Structure formats: structure tokens, C-alpha cells
């Protein structure tokens, strides 16, 4: 024997993208070449986000993609998103900003072309910026998923605020013992 330590062979990583999308594989090839040949950590992170799954790339929203450009210093920069930018029903005004994302929805593309912006894809973003200069890489609201609101140390023991599974949210379904002090214990 040599290694007195435990044997953890592979750390965590996903090397090749599990998706069989040919377009995603071509983008993986192109951004892998740029990541290993341009010394660009932007291309490193975008290549890792292309290795990243469908679920861990949450859909970006149009109001958030406006507000992350409304901050000072983001006038002429391009909002690069590895993921989808969708419509928002809340917004009223759209600026003249540039979009570089995968699979922008139809109403979002329509409102951006009415507002006067320019949407791109990753090959056009690579032709315009090999190292990724003038870009801001954005990500979406992961923790607001319905799946993540069931996740915690417990459903209710220091009251725990983590949403136990039930059919119908209301009366007669999980509201009696441990949910109030009058009927048994209370958390």
C-alpha cells in the first residue's frame, strides 16, 4: 500500500455534455478551442456552462436582464447568457441593449427588435469577441425553483420553513398535530 488516504478518484466533474444536441456539441467544440487557446477565463466559464445541464441553466428574465445592465458601467456592454432569455409580462420599456443568448423566446425577440436592440448567437458572439471583451455574463434565479423550496434540514422541527409534500394546500391536510399548540405538540 501507498495511499493511506481514501480513494476519491473523480472529483465531481462532468467532462462531456450529456445532451445529444448537435448544435450544442458544435458550440462545445468551438468554445473548448477558445477556452484552451485564448487564455480567456470568460471562455472558460462559458465552456463550463455549456458543459452544465439543462436544469442548472435556469431561464433568464427580461426584467432582470434589463436591471443588470441598468447598473453604472454597463452602457455598451453585451449581456451574454448561457441559457434562455424569456419574456416578462411586468416590463413596459425596453432599452437599446444587445443580447447574446441561446434560444430567446418569440415574444422576447419581437419586443427586442421593436425596441431596436440586436440579438446574437454564440458563434456571432465568438466572431465579435474571441476573448470575450465588452461582455457581462449573466445567470438566473436558481433558488426560486419549486423543487428547492422543499429542501432543508427538516420540514418543521425548528419550524424549518421548508414546505412538506401534500396533495391539497389547505384545511384538513397536515394542519393538526405539530402545526398548532391546541392539538398535541407544536413543532
Amino acid at each position: 500500500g501507498v495511499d493511506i488516504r481514501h480513494n476519491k478518484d473523480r472529483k465531481v466533474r462532468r467532462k462531456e455534455p450529456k445532451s445529444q444536441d448537435i448544435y450544442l456539441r458544435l458550440l462545445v467544440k468551438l468554445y473548448r478551442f477558445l477556452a484552451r487557446r485564448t487564455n480567456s477565463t470568460f471562455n472558460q466559464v462559458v465552456l463550463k456552462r455549456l458543459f452544465m445541464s439543462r436544469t442548472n441553466r435556469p431561464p433568464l428574465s427580461l426584467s432582470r436582464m434589463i436591471r443588470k445592465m441598468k447598473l453604472p458601467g454597463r452602457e455598451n456592454k453585451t449581456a451574454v447568457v448561457v441559457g434562455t432569455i424569456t419574456d416578462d409580462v411586468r416590463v413596459q420599456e425596453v432599452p437599446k441593449l444587445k443580447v447574446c443568448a441561446l434560444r430567446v423566446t418569440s415574444r422576447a425577440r419581437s419586443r427586442i427588435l421593436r425596441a431596436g436592440g440586436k440579438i446574437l448567437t454564440f458563434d456571432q458572439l465568438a466572431l465579435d469577441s474571441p476573448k470575450g471583451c465588452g461582455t457581462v455574463l449573466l445567470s438566473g434565479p436558481r433558488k426560486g425553483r419549486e423543487v428547492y423550496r422543499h429542501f432543508g434540514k427538516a420540514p418543521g422541527t425548528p419550524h424549518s420553513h421548508t414546505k412538506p409534500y401534500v396533495r391539497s394546500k389547505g384545511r384538513k391536510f397536515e394542519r393538526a398535530r405539530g402545526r398548532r399548540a391546541s392539538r398535541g405538540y407544536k413543532n
Binding site: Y165, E174, R177, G184
Partner: protein
């Protein structure tokens, strides 16, 4: 797909994924929700609080039909009518305001949120909230009750 099944991979192993010592035979713990109070209390408690007992009043012959009131927010209040309508109605013409009826859209109660611009409208609904009514008064619109 039986070719992608774990059973096809586990051919050759004697106990077949369930151990030689424990011997999972038929139903070792019971059936279904068996032992909800006696011996599975650490799984019915600590994972489903509230499962045992009565909670309140008992409305005999309840319907999910009389309490029908789908709520609309002030964010959703604008896109019930098209954007062309509000642009061509508030393109610097006069003090006229378009009517946004939520009853035709299928919503009954208007609730209060943010993002309500300067251009006032007239909202007709069967119910309102005081916050949404104050937001409509602040942007200058008119409140109309219908039935």
C-alpha cells in the same frame, strides 16, 4: 426499456440488490401507511407534521364554485388589453383613459403590486383591495365596481 434496466445488470449477483442478511421477503414494515402512530412515528412525524387530528369547521356540501375569484395583479393589469391600444390611447392626445375590464379577461378581483406607470386607466372589477385602490388613486385612474 428492459435493456436499460438495473435487473439486466444485476444478473449473476445472488441476492439481487437486496442483501443476504436482511432478507427482504414480502412486506417487512407493513402495508401502505401502516403504523402511523405506533412504530413509524419518526417518519410520519419529522416528515409530515399535522397528519393526525381535526383542524376546524366542517362545511357540509362544499363546492369549489362559489369561492371562484381568480386574482389579477397590477403587473398583469396592463397586458389584458394590447399594447397598441394603450399606446394609441395615451399618445399625448387628451385626458381620456382606456377601460381595462378584467371580467372579460376572466378575472374577478384586482390585487395590489408595484410597477404601475403614470398613464391612468379605468379598471372594472367585482372586487378590489385597498392597496390596489390606493395605487389607482395615486396614478390617477378611476375605480368602477361591476356585478
Amino acid at each position: 426499456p428492459s435493456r436499460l434496466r438495473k435487473t439486466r445488470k444485476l444478473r449473476g449477483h445472488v441476492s439481487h440488490g437486496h442483501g443476504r442478511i436482511g432478507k427482504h421477503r414480502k412486506h417487512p414494515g407493513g402495508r401502505g401507511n401502516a403504523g402511523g402512530l405506533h412504530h413509524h412515528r419518526i417518519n410520519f412525524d419529522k416528515y409530515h407534521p399535522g397528519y393526525f387530528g381535526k383542524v376546524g369547521m366542517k362545511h357540509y356540501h362544499l363546492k369549489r364554485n362559489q369561492s371562484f375569484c381568480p386574482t389579477v395583479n397590477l403587473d398583469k393589469l396592463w397586458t389584458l388589453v394590447s399594447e397598441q391600444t394603450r399606446v394609441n390611447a395615451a399618445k399625448n392626445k387628451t385626458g381620456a383613459a382606456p377601460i381595462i375590464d378584467v371580467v372579460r379577461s376572466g378575472y374577478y378581483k384586482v390585487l395590489g403590486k408595484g410597477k404601475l406607470p403614470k398613464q391612468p386607466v379605468i379598471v372594472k372589477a367585482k372586487f378590489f383591495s385597498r392597496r390596489a385602490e390606493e395605487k389607482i388613486k395615486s396614478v390617477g385612474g378611476a375605480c368602477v365596481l361591476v356585478a
